Amino acid sequence: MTRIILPGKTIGIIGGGQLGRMMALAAKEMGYKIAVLDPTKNSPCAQVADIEIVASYDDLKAIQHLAEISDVVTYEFENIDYRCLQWLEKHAYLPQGSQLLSKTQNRFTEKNAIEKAGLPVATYRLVQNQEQLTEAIAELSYPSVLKTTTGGYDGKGQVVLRSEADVDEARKLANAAECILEKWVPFEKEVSVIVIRSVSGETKVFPVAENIHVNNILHESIVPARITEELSQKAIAYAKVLADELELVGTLAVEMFATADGEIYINELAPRPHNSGHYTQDACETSQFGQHIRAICNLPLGETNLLKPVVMVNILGEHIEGVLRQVNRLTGCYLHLYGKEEAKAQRKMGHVNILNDNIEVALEKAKSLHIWDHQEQLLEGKR
Amino acid sequence: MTRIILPGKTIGIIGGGQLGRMMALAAKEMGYKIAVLDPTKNSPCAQVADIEIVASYDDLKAIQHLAEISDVVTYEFENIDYRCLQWLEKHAYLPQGSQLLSKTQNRFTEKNAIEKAGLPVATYRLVQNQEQLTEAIAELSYPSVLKTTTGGYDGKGQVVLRSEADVDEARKLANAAECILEKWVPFEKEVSVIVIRSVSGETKVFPVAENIHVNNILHESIVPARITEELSQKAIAYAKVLADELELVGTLAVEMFATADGEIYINELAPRPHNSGHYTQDACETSQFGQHIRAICNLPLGETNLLKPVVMVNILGEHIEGVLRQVNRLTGCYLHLYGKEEAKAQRKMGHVNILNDNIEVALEKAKSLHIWDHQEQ
Numbered sequence: 001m002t003r004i005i006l007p008g009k010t011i012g013i014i015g016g017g018q019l020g021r022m023m024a025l026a027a028k029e030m031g032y033k034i035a036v037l038d039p040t041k042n043s044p045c046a047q048v049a050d051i052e053i054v055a056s057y058d059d060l061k062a063i064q065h066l067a068e069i070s071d072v073v074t075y076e077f078e079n080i081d082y083r084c085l086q087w088l089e090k091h092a093y094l095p096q097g098s099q100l101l102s103k104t105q106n107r108f109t110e111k112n113a114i115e116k117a118g119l120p121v122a123t124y125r126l127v128q129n130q131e132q133l134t135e136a137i138a139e140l141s142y143p144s145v146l147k148t149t150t151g152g153y154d155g156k157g158q159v160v161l162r163s164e165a166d167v168d169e170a171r172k173l174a175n176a177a178e179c180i181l182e183k184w185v186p187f188e189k190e191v192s193v194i195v196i197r198s199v200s201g202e203t204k205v206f207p208v209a210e211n212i213h214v215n216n217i218l219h220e221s222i223v224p225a226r227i228t229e230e231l232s233q234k235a236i237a238y239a240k241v242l243a244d245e246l247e248l249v250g251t252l253a254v255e256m257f258a259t260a261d262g263e264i265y266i267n268e269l270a271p272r273p274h275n276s277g278h279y280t281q282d283a284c285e286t287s288q289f290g291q292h293i294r295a296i297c298n299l300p301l302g303e304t305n306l307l308k309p310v311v312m313v314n315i316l317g318e319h320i321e322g323v324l325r326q327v328n329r330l331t332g333c334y335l336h337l338y339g340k341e342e343a344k345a346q347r348k349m350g351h352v353n354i355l356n357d358n359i360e361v362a363l364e365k366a367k368s369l370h371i372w373d374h375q376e377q378l379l380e381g382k383r
Numbered sequence: 384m385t386r387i388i389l390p391g392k393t394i395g396i397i398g399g400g401q402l403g404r405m406m407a408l409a410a411k412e413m414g415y416k417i418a419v420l421d422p423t424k425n426s427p428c429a430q431v432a433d434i435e436i437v438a439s440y441d442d443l444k445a446i447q448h449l450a451e452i453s454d455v456v457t458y459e460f461e462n463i464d465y466r467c468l469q470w471l472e473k474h475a476y477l478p479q480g481s482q483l484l485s486k487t488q489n490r491f492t493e494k495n496a497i498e499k500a501g502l503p504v505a506t507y508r509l510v511q512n513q514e515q516l517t518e519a520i521a522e523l524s525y526p527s528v529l530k531t532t533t534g535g536y537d538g539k540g541q542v543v544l545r546s547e548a549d550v551d552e553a554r555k556l557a558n559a560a561e562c563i564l565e566k567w568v569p570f571e572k573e574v575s576v577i578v579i580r581s582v583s584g585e586t587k588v589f590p591v592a593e594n595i596h597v598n599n600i601l602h603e604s605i606v607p608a609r610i611t612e613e614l615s616q617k618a619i620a621y622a623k624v625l626a627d628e629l630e631l632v633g634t635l636a637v638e639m640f641a642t643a644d645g646e647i648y649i650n651e652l653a654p655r656p657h658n659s660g661h662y663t664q665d666a667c668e669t670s671q672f673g674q675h676i677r678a679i680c681n682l683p684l685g686e687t688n689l690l691k692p693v694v695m696v697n698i699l700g701e702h703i704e705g706v707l708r709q710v711n712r713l714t715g716c717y718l719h720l721y722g723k724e725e726a727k728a729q730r731k732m733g734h735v736n737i738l739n740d741n742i743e744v745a746l747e748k749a750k751s752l753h754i755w756d757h758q759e760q
């Protein structure tokens with residue numbers, strides 16, 4: 001309510017990946033102490049934490065131990081089960097609560113909640129068996145997209161249905177998992193907005209980012225998004241309605257499709273700092289992580305003004321040697337590396353924020369470094 | 384020379400105070416590891432370091448152990464025995480070198496480096512005994528200031544001589560330590576410029592800050608400095624010349640006196656990030672701390688554009704209670720606290736950067752919080 005977590009207190013983080021690490025580094029500038037729970041020793045967050053607890057996420061004893069030594073608890077890992085979430089809510093201080101998190105773990109549930117909040121989404125149907133798939137294909141026609149409702153840390157369970165010739169692969173997906181069938185949205189841009197809401201109801205919204213995915217992994221975020229002033233205003237208003245309606249405490253990332261015609265469809269929500277918000281570390285007055293900490297500790301929120309245009313580029317395992325090799329060429333670039341021990345080809349290892357007065361020059365900078373030639377080549381065929 | 388210390392390597396820091404802490408936080412965002420040597424456990428910097436070495440600064444064994452685990456070494460306070468820095472220069476990797484520190488560690492030898500580069504200083508005389516003090520006073524007249532050549536602590540530091548009646552206070556200081564007597568500079572404003580130069584010779588300068596001291600402790604830094612454009616250009620030019628002539632690697636803070644006739648006297652040099660540079664964490668494209676790491680590791684330097692006007696306000700021991708009690712009123716304020724355990728009245732505990740499109744609105748916010756009532760005379 002009016003409850004404040006003062007500097008000097010301990011912030012407990014569930015999950016020790018890069019999101020937890022950047023939260024921690026933000027909290028440390030303000031003099032907070034950090035405890036982290038992660039299943040692997042020497043996690044990115046653990047490298048900046050005062051206290052490390054190595055345990056499984058579903059281990060209630062370990063969760064209780066984190067809670068016991070923390071003045072406030074937050075998470076970067078979303079898939080926390082109901083028994084741990086309830087324990088934390090009632091026996092520790094978890095200002096984000098569990099309601100929003102319970103709405104966002106299932107695609108169908110999420111879409112229902114978005115519509116209940118008064119916002120538009122692609123027309124969708126629940127698919128729990130072959131018969132519901134057949135009906136959904138009838139009602140939505142082609143083209144359409146069948147996705148799993150839960151899990152998939154990459155986007156593994158997705159089948160795009162362009163013709164009757166696609167039905168058989170969709171049936172295979174519907175066999176392995178509860179699914180959702182969505183109308184295919186013709187759109188020009190994928191954009192996202194990070195919205196922040198504090199314990200006391202104060203809200204701030206970041207600018208709209210334009211997001212470029214390659215292999216279903218975020219490649220670039222571009223701010224300002226290359227859209228009309230009217231599309232931006234709409235994306236921002238939608239994000240605000242969601243934060244109000246969902247009674248957000250903490251950070252909410254809202255991912256959207258923007259059509260040439262100026263309509264927005266909400267694609268998905270993440271109740272946490274998000275990859276499409278990393279630009280904020282170097283280009284805005286407050287980062288999504290500093291905002292996250294203020295929101296849960298109930299400090300006044302910072303400003304979210306864009307101070308300079310930016311292009312964020314992800315560094316995957318496949319890019320790390322190229323980055324190190326090209327280090328002398330990183331003028332106008334702000335490098336972030338997460339300290340991950342084991343590199344893997346599509347593992348997120350870091351990101352680089354390219355700040356420039358002109359967005360097209362920053363984009364040209366990423367191309368001229370030649371680190372992401374693979375991504376740039378995959379970006380054709382285009383449309 | 385073209386040598387590069389890559390992200391992933393370990394940076395060793397001598398000293399575990401707030402400057403080292405903020406270096407470390409900057410370094411970790413790029414994926415560096417951090418070793419720190421400090422005599423007291425759980426120092427501000429150790430709370431963020433991967434490796435902590437608790438030992439004295441003169442403990443050569445521990446210094447050896449610092450070098451061993453580090454791919455590059457830097458320091459975060461000046462009162463290191465320049466002899467320890469000479470061991471690291473020859474047997475480890477200390478791109479900043481020992482010579483720049485030795486020159487700026489002594490107010491007298493510092494004057495000489497400034498004069499060599501051709502810039503104005505207050506006319507000065509070395510004072511080693513009462514006879515020399517008498518001759519210096521006769522030569523330089525009133526008003527004048529007596530300063531110890533070395534040391535940045537203790538209950539002495541300096542004596543301002545307005546008239547003959549201040550002399551007895553000066554005689555006491557003159558007996559305690561080696562001093563210089565300097566002509567009093569009539570200045571409109573104190574300003575500072577932080578200049579950065581990498582191992583490869585790339586040079587960046589930050590915007591000129593106007594600094595306001597109370598009890599000879601920095602209270603506020605104001606950026607942009609409320610000075611004319613020509614004065615700003617001169618400050619910047621003077622800092623570049625200094626970095627050039629001193630063969631600077633790393634960070635250099637240059638403190639200056641801006642006079643009514645538009646002249647600049649160099650007051651003091653610091654071969655490290657400086658309190659008057661903390662504004663850069665929130666108002667510049669790159670902080671003095673990110674620039675420092677980039678300089679010594681030989682990465683390209685970041686840009687130093689002022690992205691928004693700012694007033695940095697110091698948080699001393701006397702203020703910490705007020706800050707924590709007033710946290711709910713810090714809209715538009717960016718708070719930095721260093722993790723120091725013991726508040727002492729005039730100990731630097733943290734700082735707050737107040738960002739606002741209007742410098743006077745930032746300044747007014749500082750007053751309206753009422754935390755610094757002591758300072759606002």
Ligand SMILES: Nc1ncnc2c1ncn2[C@@H]1O[C@H](COP(=O)(O)OP(=O)(O)O)[C@@H](O)[C@H]1O
Nearest residue numbers: 122145154155156182183184185186213216267
């Ligand atoms: N209804 C739809 N219409 C058009 N394109 C879609 C639709 N659903 C998904 N996509 C495309 O597929 C990509 C992945 O879908 P998404 O729902 O974001 O799953 P994930 O969270 O696994 O990435 C999106 O970035 C978008 O390009």
Ligand SMILES: Nc1ncnc2c1ncn2[C@@H]1O[C@H](COP(=O)(O)OP(=O)(O)O)[C@@H](O)[C@H]1O
Nearest residue numbers: 505528540565566567568569573596599650651
């Ligand atoms: N020659 C001088 N003329 C006028 N004021 C001075 C002079 N020297 C120092 N001061 C004032 O006293 C303050 C402290 O002096 P300084 O030499 O910076 O000592 P310290 O390095 O211990 O702070 C300065 O910030 C300035 O305001």
Ligand SMILES: Nc1cncn1[C@@H]1O[C@H](COP(=O)(O)O)[C@@H](O)[C@H]1O
Nearest residue numbers: 015016017018019020076077347348
């Ligand atoms: N991307 C994402 C979605 N939800 C969490 N993450 C971040 O990705 C890390 C997982 O990365 P890895 O699989 O490389 O350990 C998590 O800990 C968290 O920071």
Ligand SMILES: Nc1cncn1[C@@H]1O[C@H](COP(=O)(O)O)[C@@H](O)[C@H]1O
Nearest residue numbers: 398399400401402403459460730731
């Ligand atoms: N202010 C200053 C001038 N030179 C170094 N410092 C910083 O102040 C710390 C010492 O402060 P304290 O004496 O409060 O511990 C040092 O380690 C360094 O970071």
Ligand SMILES: [Mg+2]
Nearest residue numbers: 155255267268
């Ligand atoms: Mg997606």
Ligand SMILES: [Mg+2]
Nearest residue numbers: 638650651652
């Ligand atoms: Mg000084």
